[PDB]
């Protein structure tokens, strides 16, 4: 299909409840037969500028491949989730796993 | 009259005039002085010497608070940029650091077409 390089920051209070979210998204794509290749967790790291006056947040890295239907509903799950702040999706540019 | 150790000086050196203000660490304005109130009017108000004597009228009226060490914030090019800091390196104030907060935009809010 097409690869996508997803990052999304989440609210640092919901890092207590973060890994159950990641299994919903990874079963959304793998249930739609798209594969994942990375699952890199950057963790609770310090920001450089205060997004919503909030300091340090938690970062997730995906680097997955999926058909274009799965990402559009994925954006809405990132749109309506006040645990998640400032998500991002990029285009194919064929992917493999590295780069901590 | 409430004494304080650490203050902050805001220096606003606009082209026509420079207005200095010494505040606290939390933005509550302790006192201020300006180059229009320092006797000079117009042309003489546009002078680095008028800027240096403006902070000397702000060197007092902060003596009720007794600030020893202070930060310095500058904004605006003016003539008053590298003059009022020399109005405090003689006036006995431990300058911790000097920063600059000149409001550079990122290309918004179109400027005027000023004088031809």
């Amino acid at each position: 299909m097409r690869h996508y390089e997803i990052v999304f920051m989440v609210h640092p209070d919901q890092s207590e409840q973060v890994p159950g979210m990641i299994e919903r998204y990874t079963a959304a794509i793998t249930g739609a037969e798209g594969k994942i290749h990375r699952l890199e967790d950057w963790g609770r790291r310090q920001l450089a500028y205060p997004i919503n006056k909030l300091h340090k947040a938690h970062y997730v890295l995906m680097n997955v491949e999926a058909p274009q239907e799965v990402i559009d509903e994925l954006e809405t799950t990132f749109r309506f989730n006040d645990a998640v702040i400032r998500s991002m999706v990029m285009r194919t540019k064929h992917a493999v796993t590295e780069a901590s | 009259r409430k004494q304080v150790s650490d203050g902050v000086a805001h220096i606003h050196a606009s082209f026509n005039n420079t207005i200095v203000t010494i505040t606290d660490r939390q933005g509550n304005a302790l006192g201020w002085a300006t180059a229009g109130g320092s006797g000079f009017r117009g042309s003489r108000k546009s002078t680095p010497f008028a800027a240096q004597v403006a902070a000397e009228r702000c060197a007092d009226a902060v003596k009720e608070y007794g600030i020893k060490n202070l930060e310095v914030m500058v904004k605006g090019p003016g003539p008053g940029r590298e003059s009022t800091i020399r109005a405090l390196n003689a006036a006995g104030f431990r300058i911790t650091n000097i920063t600059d907060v000149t409001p550079i935009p990122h290309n918004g809010c179109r400027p005027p077409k000023k004088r031809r």
Binding site: - | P77, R81, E82, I85, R86, N89, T96, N97, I98, T99, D100, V101, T102, I104, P105, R110, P111, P112, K113, K114
Partner: protein
């Protein structure tokens, strides 16, 4: 912007203003944009820099100084 020169500096040492922009830049953004003169005043300034190069290796002029 930010300078400390940490403990015994005793004097301004403020190279940092012309080191990046902050004197020269807002005496440019402060007025008329023209939308066109930015193409025009880049034309001659780039024309001058090639004329600056035109006399660099053409320094083989004698004049008997």
């Amino acid at each position: 912007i930010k300078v400390r020169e940490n403990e015994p500096f005793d004097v301004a040492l403020r190279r940092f203003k012309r080191s990046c922009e902050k004197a020269g830049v807002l005496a440019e953004v402060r007025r008329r944009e023209f939308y066109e003169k930015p193409t025009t005043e880049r034309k001659r300034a780039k024309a001058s820099a090639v004329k600056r190069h035109a006399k660099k290796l053409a320094r083989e002029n004698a004049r008997r100084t």
